[PDB]
């Protein structure tokens with residue numbers, strides 16, 4: 001079912017996505033250990049992910065949540081980083097992209113900071129780095145993040161001091 | 162997978178301490194997210 005459609009760099013949609021990657025990079029408390037030392041990205045490609053059946057699965061749940069929450073889905077655009085990007089875009093998110101050891105228990109994690117999702121591209125804590133060079137700060141290897149539509153509905157607020 | 166806190170659909174990790182961090186979020190049902198964009202990129206070495 002899944003099709004990847006390239007966006008031209010001239011498309012305003014390419015631009016607004018890139019602006020959200022670039023402008024949400026921050027410095028991390030690990031000094032770069034997990035995700036590398038950088039202040040910005042070289043964006044190589046952006047593809048729109050098109051799967052009718054996954055999209056309907058999403059809108060169906062969205063309508064449920066919305067009707068449980070005074071017609072407010074509380075939909076956001078958030079980043080997700082994972083070594084299983086290719087499975088996610090073909091088969092969707094489910095419990096095998098859960099982070100069972102996470103700060104907020106076992107579920108699927110998303111971030112407003114692009115650089116936070118970048119720490120997870122090669123696994124938890126960056127794993128062993130890129131497959132080719134074993135380098136969590138590799139400047140050569142191509143990485144992939146997802147930018148995702150996420151239904152939050154009524155959100156449990158947890159403080160993390 | 163674990164369940165959402167009762168009466169809730171998601172968890173928002175509000176950052177405290179690190180005044181610059183943005184939030185993280187957790188959902189407990191895969192149908193609550195759709196992967197709209199696949200971004201292929203490299204990190205850049207700072208000048």
Ligand SMILES: [Zn+2]
Nearest residue numbers: 130133138141
């Ligand atoms: Zn590499």
